[PDB]
Amino acid sequence: AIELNVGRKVTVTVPGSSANLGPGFDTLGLALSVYDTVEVEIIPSGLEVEVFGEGQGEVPLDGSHLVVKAIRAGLKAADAEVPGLRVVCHNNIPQSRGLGSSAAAAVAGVAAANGLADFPLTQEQIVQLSSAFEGHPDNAAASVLGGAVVSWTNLSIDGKSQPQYAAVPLEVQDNIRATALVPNFHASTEAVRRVLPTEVTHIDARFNVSRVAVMIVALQQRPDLLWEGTRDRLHQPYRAEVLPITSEWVNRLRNRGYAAYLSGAGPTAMVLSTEPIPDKVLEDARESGIKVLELEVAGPVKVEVNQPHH
């Protein structure tokens, strides 16, 4: 293993992301313009980790351990080692709201480690390493690649064998935007997959196959089809049971023609459009205690090298 020098420092800016996008359960992801910023500096000894981003008076954020584990895993894959690390995080991605906070933290750490080692790893390797941690693969890929992505896993059966995680970028039309409606409750709990059935009808499976295909063309060239492409029968009807309020916001929005869907497993409802959502709709959400984020589709994780080369 090559030893990296004291003073080497990078600054990683990683976007959050939204998964599923309606019918694209465990496969589609969309990077969003809300960011965690992770500075990593090689120091002579010790591990120093700082995490900031919570409101005044509130309890400290999560993910510091996740960023560290990801940095370690990246350094290993880069065949590099360090005598010491200082890690400083400014996290703006809302956590446990279905906006890809954990996945982004893993991506930041792998990408930081890669930058520190002068970038020996490929994008494909970064997607592999970051996806293996806590956050889902469709989120991690979005945070790495930017834009909209298709992701998939090959469960290697010879034998253990960690799964392959792969992803490819979609083209997104430049005028598509994303508006998040983020409720307060840290719920949903991990009982949103205990609600997913073991069996579905062939007809419903068929339905999702065609609507995910429609969603992909909607994203790339037909934003008038976003409403059709965000229909789902594989996960949202079941999760609606657990998130009755989020479901009412999605239904209300969809009934008015908005391409609304459940962000990941919730409770955030996301709306994709080419025009801004009307003020009255957004202020109604805000008065109800729902945070409104008027976001852009984000580009890829960015790694800036702070320490000059000589």
- Binding residues, by number, are 94-104
Q: Which of 37, 49, 220, 245 binds its own copies (CB under 8 A)?
A: 49
Q: How far apart are the first and last CA of the chain?
A: 23
Cα gap 20→263, rounded to integer Å? 7
- Nearest CB to its own copies, comparing residues 44 and 257: 44
User: In Å, what is the CA distance from 251 to each residue of 6, 102, 284?
Assistant: 54, 28, 15
Binders of its own copies: how many residues, by CB under 8 A? 26
Stretch of 64-72, 97-105, 211-219, 299-307 contacting its own copies, by CB under 8 A? 64-72
Q: Which is nearer to its own copies, 57 or 257 (CB)?
A: 57
**What separation in angstroms does the CA of 290 have from each of 20, 41, 138, 249?**
21, 37, 25, 10
Region of 15-23, 78-86, 162-170, 262-270 interacting with its own copies (CB under 8 A): 78-86
Contact residue for its own copies among 2, 5, 7, 50 (CB under 8 A):
50
Which of 26, 37, 68, 307: binder of its own copies (CB under 8 A)? Answer: 68
Q: Is 237 in the site for its own copies (CB under 8 A)?
A: no
Is residue 48 involved in binding its own copies (CB under 8 A)? yes
Q: Which is nearer to its own copies, 85 or 110 (CB)?
A: 85
Nearest Cα residue to 143 out of 272, 271, 269, 303: 303
Give the footprint of its own copies on this chain (CB under 8 A).
3, 44-54, 56-61, 64-65, 68, 81-85
